[PDB]
């Protein structure tokens, strides 16, 4: 159980905003507020 835990495995993200635009719009109409927040999140992580 101790050895099983990952220590540093870091799934790589997509980081292009465009592809995030699409995939957010593909599957949920509206609810624009949450879309704006999460998009802002990726936009900042790409920076810092």
């Amino acid at each position: 159980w101790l050895t099983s835990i990952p220590w540093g495995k870091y799934s790589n993200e997509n980081l292009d905003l465009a592809r995030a635009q699409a995939v957010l719009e593909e599957d949920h109409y509206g609810m624009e507020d949450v879309k704006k927040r999460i998009l802002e999140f990726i936009a900042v992580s790409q920076l810092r």
């Binding site: 905003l17 802002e40 936009a43 900042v44 790409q46 920076l47 810092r48």
Partner: protein
Amino acid sequence: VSGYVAQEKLAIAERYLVPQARALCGLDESKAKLSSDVLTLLIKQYCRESGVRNLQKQVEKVLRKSAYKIVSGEAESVEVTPENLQDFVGKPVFTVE
């Protein structure tokens, strides 16, 4: 320990608070100016609590929203101004003491 005078919170936040959140949002002063007057308007209006925690949330919100305007947006240097402010953090909440 006591509460804090409105100006007292000003003297706090310009030194020991804004730079801290600025290091949390990862920005530098070159692109994310915050005049004193915006802070005085903020603390006078949007948060009336003796503790400083609520002002800490506001100033956080403002900074990271500025970051979103940088990383993809237009301006290379956001400049908060009191007329600008209503954009970033919205409409005044409290007024009628």
